[PDB]
Amino acid sequence: MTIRFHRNDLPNLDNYQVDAVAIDTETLGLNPHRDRLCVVQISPGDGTADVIQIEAGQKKAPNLVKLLKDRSITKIFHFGRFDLAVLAHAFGTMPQPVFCTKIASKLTRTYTDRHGLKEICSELLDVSISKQQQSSDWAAEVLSQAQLEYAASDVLYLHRLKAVLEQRLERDGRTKQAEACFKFLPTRSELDLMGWAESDIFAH
Amino acid sequence: SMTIRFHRNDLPNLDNYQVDAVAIDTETLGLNPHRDRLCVVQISPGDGTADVIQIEAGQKKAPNLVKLLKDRSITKIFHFGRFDLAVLAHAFGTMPQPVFCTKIASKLTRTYTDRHGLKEICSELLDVSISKQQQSSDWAAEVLSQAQLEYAASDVLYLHRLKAVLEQRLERDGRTKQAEACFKFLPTRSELDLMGWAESDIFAH
Amino acid sequence: SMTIRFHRNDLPNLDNYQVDAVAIDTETLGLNPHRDRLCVVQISPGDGTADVIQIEAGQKKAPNLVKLLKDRSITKIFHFGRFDLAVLAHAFGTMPQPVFCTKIASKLTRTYTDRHGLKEICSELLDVSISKQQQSSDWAAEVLSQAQLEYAASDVLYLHRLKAVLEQRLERDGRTKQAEACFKFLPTRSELDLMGWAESDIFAH
Amino acid sequence: MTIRFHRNDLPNLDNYQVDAVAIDTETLGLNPHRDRLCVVQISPGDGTADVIQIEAGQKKAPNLVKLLKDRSITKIFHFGRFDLAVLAHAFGTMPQPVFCTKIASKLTRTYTDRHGLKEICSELLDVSISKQQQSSDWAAEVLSQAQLEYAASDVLYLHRLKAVLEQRLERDGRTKQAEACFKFLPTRSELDLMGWAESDIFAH
Amino acid sequence: SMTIRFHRNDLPNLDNYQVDAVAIDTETLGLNPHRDRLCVVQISPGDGTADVIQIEAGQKKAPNLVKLLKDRSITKIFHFGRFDLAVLAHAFGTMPQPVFCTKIASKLTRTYTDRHGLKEICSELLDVSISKQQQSSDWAAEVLSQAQLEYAASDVLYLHRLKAVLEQRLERDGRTKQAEACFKFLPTRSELDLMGWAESDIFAH
Amino acid sequence: MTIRFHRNDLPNLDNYQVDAVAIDTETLGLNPHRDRLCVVQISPGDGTADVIQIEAGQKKAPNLVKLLKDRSITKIFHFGRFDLAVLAHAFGTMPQPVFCTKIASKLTRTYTDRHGLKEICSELLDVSISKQQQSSDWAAEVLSQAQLEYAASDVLYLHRLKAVLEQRLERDGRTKQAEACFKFLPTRSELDLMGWAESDIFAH
Amino acid sequence: SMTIRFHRNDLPNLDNYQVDAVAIDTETLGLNPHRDRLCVVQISPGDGTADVIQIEAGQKKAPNLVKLLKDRSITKIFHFGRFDLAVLAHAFGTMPQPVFCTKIASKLTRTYTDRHGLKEICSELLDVSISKQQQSSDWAAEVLSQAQLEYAASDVLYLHRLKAVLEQRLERDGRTKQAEACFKFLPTRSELDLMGWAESDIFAH
Amino acid sequence: MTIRFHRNDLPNLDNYQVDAVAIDTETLGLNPHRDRLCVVQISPGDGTADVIQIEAGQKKAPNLVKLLKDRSITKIFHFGRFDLAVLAHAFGTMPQPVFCTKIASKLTRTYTDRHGLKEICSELLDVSISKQQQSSDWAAEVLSQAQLEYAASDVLYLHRLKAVLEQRLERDGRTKQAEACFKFLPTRSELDLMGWAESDIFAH
């Protein structure tokens, strides 16, 4: 497991001369206004990962933000709706464009209600990772090796999941609808930050 | 009279529709577009008049209406947008765009209430009285009554005026861009309903 | 008057019942056929008149009524079919057939509403006003009031007219064969209720 | 396990000179209008099974359809309400007459709320099979040996279950009511396709 | 007037209570007997008159009332039996018995309804109009209004008449013995509420 | 395990010169009007049990009924509300007087919501039995040794449970209330047969 | 008239507020203080008059009002205390204290009801008629109508009178100290709502 | 495990010359008016515990009550809302001031809904204890060694949990709000005894 650890930000973009990046975050909980960003994990898709410890009160991360702003780079998430809100709230940039493997799973894996990251890693790639846990204080001053490996596992496979899901979207005729969902997803996250996190804006 | 113009099948021409936005609603046999056929299309150019078009069973074409639905320079205004877009696309094969939905705009501006129905916003924003949506009409009946024509017309006669108020409120409260993104997605939301996700929020965790 | 004919125990003969379809309802002491006895049978031949028959406690026979229930050439029309078939079979030992149920027919045609009660369909389809089903009558009382006779009669006076409208709608919307299969199954649905499955949908996954 | 694999259709009816056949299907999910038919599995009741891979867009299966139409052949299902809708939607013929082991179980095994196929195979026959899973993309171009065996297991025991359930229906006095349920079941499936899949048509 | 007699603390004597059954209700500060004190006891001998007794804060004794509660030759009739028995036992130390509860009797006879409130049965069985139970009175107030005295009296003025009707119906429908066993258990049901099982059905599986 | 098997009825009351008997039943399910009585199991409290197979349509069991009618003999149940209804429906006699170990548990074991027979056997006596199962067709013509042992286990310990629960009722001051519950229980079962099985008659 | 005084932004001075307790309510764009801005502050000194203060978008200061909110010698009386304290602290940076909440006091005294709204207690305790809280006003509108000023004033004109009654009842029923502890905690309850626990009971098991 | 067992009360306060004590109780169940106090367990925070068996009808415990009344001694609980009500009901003194580790957990461990004592002992201290059980009659005349050890485990770690939680409250900026919750908690328990145990007094 090739994991590069950083404080605050990537040191440069030497490993990020790519057209897509895989991103996840760790926080103090599910409420972005209450629960601060603690870790950003990111992978170029080459089987390596960067795990970035974010300090309390940290307002800037310029190299990461360059990637988030770069419209030629697709930001891949599984927890897209959540992570986009957390990243926009932390550093002021709503990342775009995006691909969400959970939305893509919902639009292709029509035979199940299980769309978690552990499930799709196992089913689509035969890769074993941990489910999302509730046992870590991610604001701890020192993150353990186990925590770095957990964080890295959440981004090491997103490019490969996206490739499979793209094939299935084309096979079953839903590529254009998925793309429209991805175009809307940054707004869905903005609406969550604005005060509609518990409302489906499209409900009757 | 002059307020309501009744037609069979389609608009007769587009003389009244040389406009930048039209207001649309539909009447059907119920809430399931695959089971419940389109029965009426009601449309207004925003001038205080309305066209009420009776749609026949099995009707696959309505070329003049469809020109308006396809015309990207004309905004199609709805209150029941998610539903009506699915019904219209299923009936005639064109997903209307671009759109403005007064229900979504109400949800993003009238933050002090959970009541976003058409009767409520007509009364609150315009002091206009209309009927709530009813469950008492067989809209596939051979003969539509004058009361039914008036009910259908009332659902489109005020949408331009509501849109004007709601646009001002979206700008005042800083939500114009988010509303526009919702309107851009709405045709896909309706497509997903027709495809089999009508009971699912695609953005749920 | 001439509209309502009151009887004890049974019809006196079948002079008014030389017909191809009869309309039937019942009054009981409540919703549980094993606990709550049959108290009234109301029946109409479809000519704007009704017979209201007071049933005694412990009554096991009603031969003239039962001839009609058994006669396969006479369709028994109900609105409360699932319930009334169970009550009648439990009381007199004959499961009536064949049947037409206006509630099932309403569910298969009035696809724009969730309101399928008898008062609603009488008003909507016929412009006829009747009372909704009430919870204020001890139907086992020794004396039935004129108001009670009128209420019971109103539940059967309009079923032929409702059936005519609903048959037309089933044909219009293409569901005649499915409705007929529901009517064929309904006596078994009522038998299953009496057997102990009253709270279970036998077709559930 | 004698499994005969086929593409599209049975090649002939040489193995189907019988009075009853056992049928199940695999699909992309629970919504017949969205989720296509992917596999038809069928057994003559002799301890063998045919597993038929159905192509995307496939409109015909003439030998299978002959069996579905043949009124002298009872079609046995456990998932009857679902499979009848799927088969009618795929090929245009509503199979009849039918026997449903789940309905028969509900009418005889009055001491339990567990009416799944795995449960009744174990209880009535002491046979072990897998429960219905949510881990298979049945639209995959190549089905695995494990998938063929899973599909075959769903039809290999239905004749034997029907024989036991018929004895219990007669013992407890419910044969005629069960038969009326089987006569109505094709209509129940038609009503599902027509738009009433979430409604009990007999509710008050 | 002569219909309502108002008293402080207790009945003045038992001149009006040389009877075989009395009708009782209470008013309190709410539904929790440990928190919400007894404020009024209303009682009638069944002759169309009622005594309304204001109970003081901290009152532990009411000897004349308590003689009636203890007297096993006098049936205490309630509609709100489960509640009032707990309140009275908590206030004065005597669990009243024997009892007849018109609500339980209604549940065992009026099998055609889920409405077993006092206003409903007064109207249906006697054609008597009273108020439903209200939530607008501070019954611990220093001064009780004439309207409050009339409300309290109305809750006991009709219980003998209801009991007579309900006894006849219990006999007609064959449930007298089961009702009597319910009445025998009711004081224990009230004791169990005071002991800490107020939210539990002790007979649940 | 001393188990005496019988068809239809006890042959005599030689083992029942006692002041209390422990009783349970097996049936085709939870609805006494639909689901017939199949087994009566009974113990004198001496570590032995009688298991009585009841035939379809059986209307009499005179020796058992003598015990049910005998007012000098307490009938002990754990499933009292159910078993009393089943026995009264089968043979025409509502047993009395009774003691119910489930009611007694609810009135003493105030620290738990678990009042099943397996739980109280383990907690009060350190005895291990099976929980109530849903896998047996109790109307089968031949009951297995395992079924006889299961049925016997349900009555072998009720006298001992009653003795413990009586001590706890006296310790915590609830003997009189429990006795009133036991006096009412036959009526509660009658009301179930009469049509109130789903209603708490004491509800507001 | 003299009953309602209208102001922009703040009170003009504190001539009417040389008092030991003030009554306060607010109007906003909705229930979420982070999304829905403060639009009106209404305040009364308890003399049958009220000040209604229109708050501008983006307003961060209201120095005269804030002096009252900060003054520990002045009790701030609310009915909607938990909400209004959060709104006021979010708007101007001061958490008002000390406080008296008539809703909490009602819950601790009116133990016979689950209705603790302002309209209900005004009617029951004072025989005063006001409107319930409405969902029909855009309180951020440029122009507030006379009817809106009257509605806002009615929410503060009676709080001193309600507090007087409720204080007497708290003493009568022995709950003064517990109520005071609730009032002391209430500002923290409002802070916890703003911090992200608005949907959580912090004292739940 | 250093456990000192006592009947009725501490014999003296020789082990309690401390500024904070850790307390829990065992009872006959969750309703303080119905279910009597059976055990008080208390620790000075030095790795020892006192387990005090409380008799039926016991009205006094003067040495324990001295600690409960002493305003210079913080009473630490995990089950604070419950234990405060039980102690006040038993002996007449509402303990104050208090610290509740469950409230402190809710205000710091924002990434989880699991705030039980077993969970926080494991996560914050790597200490293993049993969860709260429902298998003990705590009114038994003789408590077992296992019961004494269970009771002691509930107080041996509360001082250490409080120290960790205080650090987290300061780190995340919630010390003052937590202190106000602790000041209100005795009133919350009084309101439970008064008749509001099922109501959130702050609800709209």
Numbering used by the authors:
A (entry chain A), D (entry chain A), F (entry chain A), H (entry chain A): 1 to 204
B (entry chain B), C (entry chain B), E (entry chain B), G (entry chain B): 0 to 204
Quote the study's own text.
Orn and NrnC are 3′–5′ exonucleases with a DnaQ fold containing the catalytic DEDD motif, a domain that is common in enzymes that act on nucleic acids. Notably, Orn (and its eukaryotic ortholog REXO2) or NrnC activity is critical for cellular growth, rendering them unique amongst the exoribonucleases known to date. Through quantitative structure-function analyses, we show here that NrnC-type RNases share this narrow substrate length preference with Orn. The structures confirm an octameric assembly as a conserved feature of NrnC-type RNases.
To further understand the structural basis of NrnC’s substrate preference, we determined structures of B. melitensis NrnC (NrnCBm) in several apo and partially pGG-bound states. (C) Superposition of four apo-NrnCBm conformations based on three independent crystal forms (comprising chains apo1A/apo1B for form 1; apo2A/apo2B for form 2, and apo3A/pGG-bound3B for form 3), compared to the pGG-bound conformation of the same protein shown in (B). In a second apo-NrnCBm crystal form, we captured an alternate conformation in which the conserved hydrophobic residue F79 moves into the active site. The movement of this residue, which is adjacent to the phosphate cap residue H78, is realized through a flip of the peptide backbone and would introduce a clash with the nucleotide. In the same structure, the flexible SKQQQS loop is collapsed into the active site, trapping the catalytic residue Y150 in an intermediate conformation, which would introduce further clashes with the nucleotide substrate. Simultaneously, a rotamer change of the phosphate-cap residue H204 pivots its sidechain away from the active site, opening it for access to substrates. This conformation may depict a post-hydrolysis state, suggesting a mechanism for product release.
